[PDB]
Amino acid sequence: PKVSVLITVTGVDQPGVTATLFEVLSRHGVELLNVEQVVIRHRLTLGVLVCCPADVADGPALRHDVEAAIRKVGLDVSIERSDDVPIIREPSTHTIFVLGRPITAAAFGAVAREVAALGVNIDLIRGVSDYPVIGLELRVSVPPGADEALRTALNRVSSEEHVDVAVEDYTLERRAKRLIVFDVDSTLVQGEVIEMLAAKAGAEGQVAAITDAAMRGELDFAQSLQQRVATLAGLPATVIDEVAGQLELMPGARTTLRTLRRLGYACGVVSGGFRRIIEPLAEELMLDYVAANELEIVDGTLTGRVVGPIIDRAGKATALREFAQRAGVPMAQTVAVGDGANDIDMLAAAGLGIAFNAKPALREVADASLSHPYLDTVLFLLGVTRGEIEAADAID
C-alpha cells in the first residue's frame, strides 16, 4: 500500500471502541504501522497510523466510514494524510523518580520547571506508589550532555522542596541492574551495632560520638574503628550473640530483599562491622555475599582489636568488585546502598549508588538519595511499583 493515514480517536472512554475502529478500517484496504492507546481517568486516546493505497486515502469512503462510526457512539475522531510523520516514537533517554510524603504541587511544579529549563522533554508521567510514600515517575528525553546539569538542578529542588528526586539512565543496558549490596548499620539494620556493643561496656556515648564523626567523613575510618572497638576490651565474647539477638531490620528491609530475589538479583552486604554478627543474619536472609571485619578474641574475651585486613572506604569498593566478578556482573549493572561517608567509594564504583537517610558527605556524591525511613523506596528506584510488589506477594 503506497500512502500513510493517521486516525486519532479521543473522548470519554467506552467499551468496544478499539474493536469497532479496526473492524471499520478492515473494510478499506488497511495495514497497521503503529497503534498507541491508553485511558487516563476515563479519557481515551487511540492513535493509529496505517498505510493504504493512495487510491483509498484520497477517496471519501474511508473518512465517512470512520467519522460516522466513532461519532455515533459519542467520541471524536481526526483523519489526515501523514507521509512525513514518525512511524514509532523514540525511547526515553532517562527516567526521573519523585518520592514524597507529601509531594506538594509546588515541589512537582519545581521539578517540571527545571526539566523544561534544560530543554528536557517529558515523555510520560505515571504513579509508582501510594505507600509507604507517594511515588511518581517521569520518563524523559534529555539533550546530550545536559544530564549532569539536570541532576544538579533536581538535587537543589530535592533539598528545597522536601522530596527525593532521582535521575537515572533508562537505556536497555544501564537499567538491567542485576546485583545489589547493602551496608548494614543504619541501612539494612536499624542503628549502629558498635554502639550496641559499647553500651555493654558502659561506653555508648564515647562510641556513638566517634561513630557519628566517622560516618560524617571527619575521621579516618580505620583509626575510628580501632578507637571504638578498643572500648570493648574485656567484654566476654558472649556479647556478640546477645547484640545479634537484639538487631531490628530497617522497616521495609524484608519486602526489599524478597522483591529483589523475585527479580533474580544477586544480593550482598559490605560492612565495616563484624562478621560474627552479620553472618547469623545474612544466612537467615539468604544473601549470596558477606564482607565484614572480625573482632579479636582471646580466651573467650574481646581484646579490643580487630583481626586485619580492615574493611575501610577503599575496602568496601574492593568488596563490591570482588562480588561482581564472582557473580559475572559488570559494574555498570551493580547497585550499592549506604548511609555513611564510609560508603563513598562503594557507591561511586557501583552502577547505581543510593544514599539511604545519609550523612551529607555521602548524599553529596550519590547518584540518588532517599530521605524517608522505608528501605523499600529502593525498589521504586529499581523500576518496581508498589502495585507490582503487592500482586506478586498476594500470589505467595
Can residue 345 be called a binding residue for Mg ion (CB under 5 A)? no
Contact 379, 389 (CB under 8 A): yes
Judged by CB under 8 A, the chain residues 150 through 179 that form the site for its own copies are: 171-173, 176, 178
User: Is position 183 annotated in a ligand binding site?
Assistant: yes
Taking CB under 8 A as the criterion, the residue among 72, 84, 105, 248 binding its own copies is 105
Can residue 389 be called a binding residue for its own copies (CB under 8 A)? yes
Can residue 340 be called a binding residue for Mg ion (CB under 5 A)? yes
Q: What is the DSSP letter of 352?
A: E
Give the β-pairing of 368-370 and 352-356.
parallel
User: Which are the contacts of 144, defined by CB distance < 8 A and separation ≥ 6?
Assistant: none
Q: How far apart are CA 365 and CA 383, in angstroms?
A: 22
- Sketch the per residue contact string, 217 through 256, with Cl ion: x for CB under 5 A, - otherwise: ----------------------------------------
Taking CB under 8 A as the binding criterion, the range among 130-138, 209-217, 233-241, 339-347 that sits at the site for its own copies is 130-138
How many chain residues touch its own copies (CB under 8 A)?
Answer: 75
Can residue 64 be called a binding residue for its own copies (CB under 8 A)? no
User: Is position 76 annotated in a ligand binding site?
Assistant: no
How many chain residues touch Cl ion (CB under 5 A)?
Answer: 3
Which residue lies nearer to its own copies by CB, 79 or 346? 79
Question: Buried b / exposed e across 364-374, counting CB within 10 Å, b at 16+?
Answer: eebbbbbbbeb
Return left, alpha or beta for 202; rule: phi > 0 is left, psi -120 to 50 is alpha, else beta: left
Contact 184, 195 (CB under 8 A): no
Catalytic pick among 65, 83, 123, 183: 183
396 part of the active site:
no
Report the candidate in 225, 236, 234, 323 with the shortest Cα–Cα distance to residue 274: 225
Contact 317, 345 (CB under 8 A): yes
Taking CB under 8 A as the binding criterion, the range among 14-22, 140-148, 202-210, 346-354 that sits at the site for its own copies is 14-22
Q: How far apart are CA 135 and CA 128, in angstroms?
A: 5
Taking CB under 5 A as the criterion, the residue among 11, 100, 135, 272 binding Cl ion is 272
Q: How many CA atoms lie within 13 A of 383 on its CB side?
A: 16
- Binding site for substrate: residue ranges? 192, 228, 271-272, 316, 342
The residues of the shown chain that bind Mg ion, judged by CB under 5 A, are 183, 185-186, 339-340
Q: Which residues are annotated as a binding site?
A: 183, 185, 192, 228, 271-272, 316, 339, 342
Q: Which residues are catalytic?
A: 183, 185
